[PDB]
Design a binder for these strands. Structure first.
Length: 84
RNA sequence: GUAGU
């Protein structure tokens, strides 16, 4: 599982991602790659599902939209989470 | 308003 989420609004948050992505399955993780000085979302983030069956639905649907902006969700390039 | 560990 795990997906990159492009085309977001500058008003989108990772709680707002969970609010939209909870329609396809329970999310295991959500992120928005925002600037900490200007609070701009950069127009993108990430979401992980508790099962692949939520990833399957997000790929199978032809269009997505959050805060009146067309979003572009896709399979995430592999990475390793760091402990803290 | 589009690539993170």
């Amino acid at each position: 599982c795990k997906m990159f989420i492009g085309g977001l609004s500058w008003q989108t948050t990772q709680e707002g991602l969970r609010e939209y992505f909870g329609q396809f399955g329970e999310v295991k993780e959500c992120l928005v790659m925002r600037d900490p000085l200007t609070k701009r979302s950069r127009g993108f983030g990430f979401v992980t599902f508790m099962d692949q069956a939520g990833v399957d639905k997000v790929l199978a649907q032809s269009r997505h939209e959050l805060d009146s902006k067309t979003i572009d969700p896709k399979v995430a390039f592999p990475r390793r989470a760091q402990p803290k």
